Ligand SMILES: CO/N=C(\C(=O)NCB(O)O)c1csc(N)n1
Ligand SMILES: [K+]
């Protein structure tokens with residue numbers, strides 16, 4: 001609805017920085033509304049959904065098992081690893097790592113999972129092979145969050161991300177069982193409360209993944225809709241603001257409130 005664009009472009013103003021937005025019909029793939037849809041933004045932790053999509057594609061092909069245990073050391077821990085720092089002794093399964101990476105945004109979990117698929121180059125190859133010729137992962141945690149101005153490393157566009165997410169959640173890319181597992185991890189997101197979830201009406205479904213990075217970067221990807229089932233995808237990114245995290249969060253929550261109001 002154009003009223004939501006009032007709020008998006010208000011955000012870009014308030015934040016002193018670019019905001020990218022797209023609202024996509026889940027069933028049809030129709031772009032309902034957009035802003036800067038084909039400009040690049042750092043993915044930050046939103047890539048972790050793509051990562052676990054690639055992992056689940058390998059499970060479906062018999063190249064990985066969700067119950068396989070990976071053992072790691074203090075040597076693997078990177079900043080912001082609230083789950084993996086607790087399991088150094090006995091390790092974690094692939095399933096557990098994807099849960100951690102998505103619900104808790106655990107960074108070591110993401111690095112361990114990247115290692116399983118052959119690293120950033122292979123995630124990018126996986127994306128290109130599914131028709132996403134835009135999104136690229138180049139680095140590991142933590143450096144992939146550096147958000148250097150005009151750098152295309154570790155970036156997506158709102159449009160590329162939204163259509164990739166649609167394909168993962170609804171397409172023949174993944175078996176039904178694997179698509180639902182991915183959804184389930186995203187529904188279980190624990191570290192996105194101040195964002196779209198704070199605008200979500202009772203009874204609505206949301207499956208999301210947030211991101212934060214350097215230089216004011218912030219974003220979210222989500223599938224959401226009324227009566228317990230998703231019907232649209234929303235992608236919001238920003239980078240470059242000097243605003244506080246609370247300020248960034250509130251702008252995203254307010255974009256959410258508007259898109260809900262005008263659904
Ligand atoms: C909780 O972390 N803050 C992060 C981070 O590593 N986020 C991972 B994901 O985008 O949710 C961070 C990285 S650079 C920065 N400033 N904050
Ligand atoms: K429109």
Ligand SMILES: [K+]
Nearest residue numbers: 072073088089
């Ligand atoms: K160990």
